[PDB]
């Protein structure tokens, strides 16, 4: 759902998948909106299955991020970072995506 935090504190956007394989690498919806195949607009991040591909201090992960924690506990947030966020779980298999249109705004 929608969560709030302060400057530099812990955000959350609840969405989790499973780590697949070193040969079945799959990205995630990260950005803002609805990523049908791929665009919930203004895409800001992608991750992977067997590692965590791309995450920053401004796009931050406090949990166990290598096993599929792509719930971005966003550190040092501005309002330009805030808004609706792209997150959707691409389950391995055909036609099984769950699109979350979830707003995570931090002051």
């Amino acid at each position: 759902v929608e969560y709030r935090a302060e400057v530099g504190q812990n955000a959350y956007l609840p969405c989790f998948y499973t780590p697949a394989a070193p040969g079945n690498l799959v990205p995630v919806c990260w950005g803002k909106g609805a990523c049908p195949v791929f665009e919930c607009g203004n895409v800001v991040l992608r991750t992977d299955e067997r590692d965590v591909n791309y995450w920053t201090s401004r796009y931050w992960l406090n949990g166990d991020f290598r096993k599929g924690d792509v719930s971005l506990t966003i550190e040092n947030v501005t309002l330009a970072d805030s808004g609706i966020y792209c997150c959707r779980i691409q389950i391995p298999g055909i036609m099984n995506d769950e699109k979350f249109n979830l707003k995570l705004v931090i002051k």
Partner: protein
């Protein structure tokens, strides 16, 4: 019924590591008289998929010049071709794999000629076996990708006293200098073991307090660059036996000591195809 001193024959060895490519798949020793086929089975997963298209099935048929290439595919025996394996009944067998994620180097007539390709994700090989009557001095399956150069160790002895430990380095097709060494943990040159097939030899030299010794060289060695080498260092009840390609390379006299000359240094491009247990 010749010099075994390792195992009551026939012998099998389970996996030393989970599969990362950069290994050697090893039947180096002698043969029995009933080598008709084996079952070296290297079977596939994707993640834990357990049943996809399979990287390897290996068996030799001891007459006329190959090792077989074969697969599983969702629970059935794949393409098993009828031809045979060159060496005559009495002498050696040498399966010597340079393992990539795209080639496993099959060796016949003591020299690798054919490469057998992977198709699969990275960590996805979980099996091994042998079938039939066989006369084993060593079986090993393990290793990984080592970035070039690296610094690591060789496990226990180098040349195994009372046993035979076979020494697995990478003569690479696209490398620079090719070795795993037989020295101590301090880093000196005690027996700088070099399957350097850019230099096309197995060189071993000994430094004992500023004095270099015999410089033991020149044994059988018809093998080729592009191999995962199996370089056989026995210690029998009667002598210290050094074999390359299943016949005796040299004899290990005391220059520096036996009993855990097992020091590894890696320089240049050698994508190591073995660090091995007993």
């Amino acid at each position: 019924m010749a010099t075994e001193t390792n195992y009551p024959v026939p012998y099998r060895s389970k996996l030393t590591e989970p599969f990362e490519p950069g290994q050697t798949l090893i039947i180096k020793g002698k043969t029995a008289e009933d080598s008709v086929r084996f079952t070296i089975n290297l079977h596939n997963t994707s993640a834990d998929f357990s049943g996809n298209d399979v990287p390897l099935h290996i068996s030799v048929r001891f007459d006329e010049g190959k090792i077989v290439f074969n697969t599983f595919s969702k629970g059935e025996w794949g393409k098993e071709e009828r031809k045979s394996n060159p060496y005559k009944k009495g002498d050696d067998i040498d399966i010597r794999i340079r393992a990539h994620d795209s080639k496993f180097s099959i060796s016949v007539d003591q020299k690798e000629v054919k490469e057998y390709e992977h198709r699969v994700p990275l960590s996805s090989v979980t099996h091994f076996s042998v079938d039939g009557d066989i006369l084993i001095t060593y079986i090993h399956w393990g290793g990984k990708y080592y970035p070039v150069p690296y610094e690591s160790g060789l496990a226990g002895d180098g040349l195994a006293p009372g046993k035979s430990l076979l020494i697995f380095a990478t003569p690479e097709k696209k490398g620079k200098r090719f070795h795993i060494n037989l020295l101590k943990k301090n880093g000196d040159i005690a027996l700088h073991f070099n399957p350097r097939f850019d230099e096309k030899a197995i060189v071993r030299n000994s430094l004992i307090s500023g004095e270099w010794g015999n410089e033991e060289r020149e044994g059988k060695n018809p093998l080729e660059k592009g191999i995962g080498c199996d370089l056989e260092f026995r210690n029998e009840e009667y002598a210290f036996q050094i074999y390359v390609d299943g016949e005796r390379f040299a004899t290990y006299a005391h220059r520096l000591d036996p009993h855990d000359i097992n020091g590894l240094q890696i320089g240049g491009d050698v994508e190591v195809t073995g660090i091995q247990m007993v």
